[PDB]
Paper text:
Here, we present the first structures of [name] (N‐[name] and N‐EGF3), which has only 58% sequence identity with human Jagged1 (N‐EGF3), together with the longest known structure of a Delta‐like4 ligand (human Delta‐like4 N‐EGF3). Two crystal forms of [name] (N‐[name]) (green) and one crystal form of [name] (N‐EGF3) (dark green) were solved, including a total of seven crystallographically independent copies of N‐[name], and 1 copy of N‐EGF3 (N.b. not all of EGF3 is visible in the electron density). All of these copies have been superposed on each other by alignment of the DSL domain, showing some flexibility in the hinge region between the C2 and DSL domains, and further flexibility in the hinge regions between the EGF domains. However, the angle between adjacent domains can vary subtly, resulting in the ligand structures appearing to fall into two groups, one group including Jagged1, Delta‐like1 and some structures of [name], and the other including Delta‐like4, and some structures of [name]. The observation that [name] is split across the two groups suggests that there is some flexibility between adjacent domains of the Notch ligands and that all may be able to adopt these different conformations. It is therefore likely that the conformation seen is determined by crystal packing. The Jagged1 and [name] C2 domains bind calcium ions (shown in red), whereas Delta‐like4 and Delta‐like1 do not; the aspartates involved in calcium binding are not conserved in Delta‐like4 and Delta‐like1. The C2 loops are ordered upon calcium binding in both Jagged1 (Chillakuri et al, 2013) and [name] and contain the amino acid ligands for calcium binding although the number of calcium ions bound differs.
Residue numbers in the entry: 27 to 56, 60 to 119, 124 to 309
């Protein structure tokens, strides 16, 4: 899953006509064109690659459009790293078009951009077309914008495009899923190729095994949290290296678990009897 983004920043139409030859608003005729200028908006078509591009549909990969951005000619804020942070602090840009997708990104594509005159009527009317431009190319998912320059029969266009994966999605297709977690099913983070990177203090496939504190006697103890050393029954100490004497032992010692060797002049099972 990912997104296709397109940013329009410049359009120039000196005469203020349509692709047919007539003026945008007024008469129908093929001095200038007057003061009622073109009410310009943009339509975006995204489809499969074509060695010889056709100005056709359908838009197999997606489509979008903007409202009226300006008149016959106008300038808008371009895209870039500086502009990406300026948007993270904020309604949203009119000249930005976002086309989300769920399929695997095929890297190759064909982009068609159209400029239209608006007359406050939804009815399709092919005679309101100002300019149509097309670009067949190749792009990979990254947060860097790429600039494109178009000069058709009527208008000049300037725009930037880029592709980004959704969150928890990686690889050049945006189709590899990896989400960081820390529960019974693993303790990992994701890298750039959607691979599992164990958190500090863990190992294993799914990062399910933990590293015990350095020096832990792993024949007498283990760990469930990284960096600890909990002893099995019968052992004690920081490294689980010391035996535990017989339960109740007082003046006795062990070398192996559950022993209780009495000191001199001490008797009984627990070495608790004074024999003086
Ligand atoms: C005739 O149409 C124009 C074109 O506007 C619009 O473009 C179409 C292609 C379509 O996408 C519409 O959905 C879209 O609104 C109308 O002009 C515009 O009117 C809108 C809302 O009426 C304005 O948007 C707003 O901006 C104000 C700040 O100024 C903000 O507070 C609002 O919440 C809202 O976002 C838009 O700025 C304005 N544009 C221009 C160039 O005038 C026009 O109203 C319409 N006329 C009639 C009689 O229907
Ligand atoms: Ca018109
Ligand atoms: Ca107009
Ligand atoms: Ca118009
Ligand atoms: Cl010119």
């Amino acid at each position: 899953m990912g997104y296709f983004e397109l940013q329009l920043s410049a359009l120039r139409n000196v005469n203020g006509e349509l692709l047919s030859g007539a003026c945008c608003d007024g008469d129908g005729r093929t001095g200038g064109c007057g003061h009622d200028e073109c009410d310009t908006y943009v339509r975006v078509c995204l489809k499969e690659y074509q060695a010889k591009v056709t100005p056709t549909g359908p838009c197999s990969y997606g489509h979008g459009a903007t409202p009226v951005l300006g008149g016959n000619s106008f300038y808008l804020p371009p895209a870039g790293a500086a502009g990406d942070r300026a948007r993270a602090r904020a309604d949203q840009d009119p000249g930005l078009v976002v086309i989300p997708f769920q399929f695997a990104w095929p890297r190759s594509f064909t982009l068609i951009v159209e400029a239209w005159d608006w007359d406050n009527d939804t009815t399709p009317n092919e005679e309101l077309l100002i300019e149509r431009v097309s670009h067949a190319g190749m792009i990979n998912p990254e947060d860097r914008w790429k600039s494109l320059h178009f000069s058709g029969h009527v208008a000049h266009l300037e725009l930037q495009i880029r592709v980004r994966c959704d969150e928890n999605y990686y690889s050049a297709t945006c189709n590899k899923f990896c989400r960081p977690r820390n529960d019974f099913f693993g303790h990992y983070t994701c890298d750039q190729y959607g691979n599992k990177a164990c958190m500090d203090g863990w190992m294993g496939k799914e990062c399910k095994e933990a590293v015990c504190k350095q020096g832990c006697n792993l024949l007498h103890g283990g760990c469930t949290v990284p960096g600890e050393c909990r002893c099995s029954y019968g052992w004690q100490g920081r490294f689980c290296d010391e035996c535990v004497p017989y339960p109740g032992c007082v003046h006795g010692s062990c070398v192996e678990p559950w022993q209780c060797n009495c000191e001199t002049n001490w008797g009984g099972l627990l070495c608790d009897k004074d024999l003086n």
